[PDB]
Amino acid sequence: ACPAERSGHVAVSDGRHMFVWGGYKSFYLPREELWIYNMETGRWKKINTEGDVPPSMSGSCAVCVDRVLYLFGGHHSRGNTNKFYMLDSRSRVLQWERIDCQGIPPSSKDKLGVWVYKNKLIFFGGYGYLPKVLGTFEFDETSFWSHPRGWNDHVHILDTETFTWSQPITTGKAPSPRAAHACATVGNRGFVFGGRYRDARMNDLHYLNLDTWEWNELIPQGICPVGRSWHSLTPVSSDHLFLFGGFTTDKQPLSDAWTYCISKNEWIQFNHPYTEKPRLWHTACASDEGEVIVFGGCANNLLVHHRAAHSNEILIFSV
Amino acid sequence: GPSSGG
Known about the structure:
The structure holds 2 protein chains of 2 kinds.
Chain A: E1 7-13, E2 17-24, E3 33-38, E4 44-48, E5 50-51, E6 61-65, E7 68-72, E8 75-76, E9 79-80, E10 84-88, E11 95-98, E12 109-110, E13 113-117, E14 120-129, E15 137-139, E16 149-159, E17 164-166, E18 182-186, E19 189-193, E20 196-197, E21 200-201, E22 205-209, E23 215-218, E24 232-235, E25 240-247, E26 253-261, E27 266-270, E28 283-286, E29 291-295, E30 314-318
Chain B: no helix or strand
């Protein structure tokens, strides 16, 4: 029992079960399928969901808060969306619910990132159509020749107490607009690393203070990882982020792994047995046993669609 | 399609 290979899916976890949905391969994976990976046993279970099932999408943004799945955005066969769904997995047959949220939602987009803080889901960045909204938008000129698309640096809050969208008034210098960056939350710090913007897959590291809404840039002393998009960034402790895979400005698929030590502001390269298994647009989830479970994604330049090496392998890192 | 902008 194993799910088909795919890139651009979502994977969220409670530390024990990892829920996999969506993505595409070589096209979109079946919308009603929810794959559950037991991190302790290593076994899969497919279930068919009901209710307001989202369309099959890549680049959607999902979270698991107290075993409630939330999903925003993505790209389906007719383009980007800004719909918001929730799937309670706490129990019966799982039923999707499309949440008609109050307030101004974000623009339709995919390949963004989210931080979870108290009752708030905080979404940053992504790629989609021209957006009233705070922040900046920057067109992708390769989309001009349909609807043009571009990157944003937008921060949006969905307050789960009321399912109301809003935007915080931030201080500091936001990261540039970007997509396929990776976000990770530790405490009240929402970290974002890398991502694609114009002609670069970037190497910069920021966090947004989720209490005071101040942006900070982190300059680590010493060797930093090469700039990338489509990588994963995973909290593995109150003081370490785990970086794996991605895709460089020069289209190199990556298999390096690093841990960022927050308190020392330092990157440490991480040796592992998958140096011959680069992955981009995979997912990664931390286990309660201190592991990082990488699933899916593409082993080569997925931009050459007819040659794309999509994967269904589980990679287990012991951090 | 899905991969643009990354």
